[PDB]
Design a binder for this molecule. Sequence first.
Ligand SMILES: OC[C@@H](Nc1ncnc2[nH]ccc12)C1CCCC1
Ligand SMILES: [Cl-]
Length: 167
Amino acid sequence: VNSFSGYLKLTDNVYIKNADIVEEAKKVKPTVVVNAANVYLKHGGGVAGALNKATNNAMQVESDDYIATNGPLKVGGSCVLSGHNLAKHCLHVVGPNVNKGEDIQLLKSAYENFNQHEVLLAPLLSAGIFGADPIHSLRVCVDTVRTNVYLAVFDKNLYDKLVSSFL
Ligand SMILES: OC[C@@H](Nc1ncnc2[nH]ccc12)C1CCCC1
Ligand SMILES: [Cl-]
């Protein structure tokens, strides 16, 4: 039993809700919140910009030190950093950005990072400003993640479309 509330159950392990991931994280304070990161951990917009703003830029400060030490992530890769005031940990995961010409096949690799954590609050990877089809991202999530994932879909119209089209 966990403290996530109001989610629709899609499969044994995948759950979904129309919600602002920032507001959800502040309420639940989950062990792991997933950020829709880029390889430079530059949290400018989308989920990343919103999560970073909610940390008063502490996420960005921590991320800049991470990059200065380690260099950029790989597309499809991840790193674990602090969750600041939002969660215990933030799993920064880089899905492919179609608006950069990156290989959508890497979306499965990106979701595989979730399997290293028993429970996560997450957005749909590569959706929104990363330019992939959210219906496809949900299919990849369900077919790749085996741990317990609570998906927050900001857009209500998109949320309704994902449920009604879910196979
Ligand atoms: O990952 C892309 C995802 N974006 C967010 N998800 C959850 N919370 C969010 N807060 C700010 C942006 C954001 C899109 C939202 C509708 C479909 C995918
Ligand atoms: Cl977005």
